[PDB]
Amino acid sequence: SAKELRCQCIKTYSKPFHPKFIKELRVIESGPHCANTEIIVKLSDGRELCLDPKENWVQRVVEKFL
């Protein structure tokens, strides 16, 4: 019902990687505009990494950190 939705993370990292520099993480709702849910993490160095929810290790990152 709104065009507020946007696919910020065009590409995601599928290769397993668990950085200890993650302090915060944001979750973006895909909705009708985006077929896949977008998960992004924020590193203490001001770095952003896009993760694919289809990957099991990605869930581990979210679950373990939160």
Side-chain angles (χ1 to χ4, degrees):
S1 355
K3 293 180 179 180
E4 290 172 345
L5 299 175
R6 210 230 102 103
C7 257
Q8 184 178 355
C9 291
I10 293 169
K11 296 180 182 297
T12 60
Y13 205 61
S14 60
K15 299 180 180 180
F17 184 69
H18 300 280
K20 65 182 178 63
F21 296 96
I22 300 171
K23 61 180 180 180
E24 290 172 346
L25 65 126
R26 291 185 290 110
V27 180
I28 301 169
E29 290 172 346
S30 41
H33 286 79
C34 294
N36 298 314
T37 305
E38 302 178 60
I39 300 170
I40 189 167
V41 295
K42 175 72 73 168
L43 264 66
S44 61
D45 203 24
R47 299 290 183 272
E48 296 180 353
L49 179 62
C50 298
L51 302 178
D52 181 24
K54 290 187 290 297
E55 299 290 345
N56 185 59
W57 67 270
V58 170
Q59 186 63 56
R60 293 181 65 82
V61 172
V62 173
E63 182 178 0
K64 289 292 183 180
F65 277 86
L66 300 177

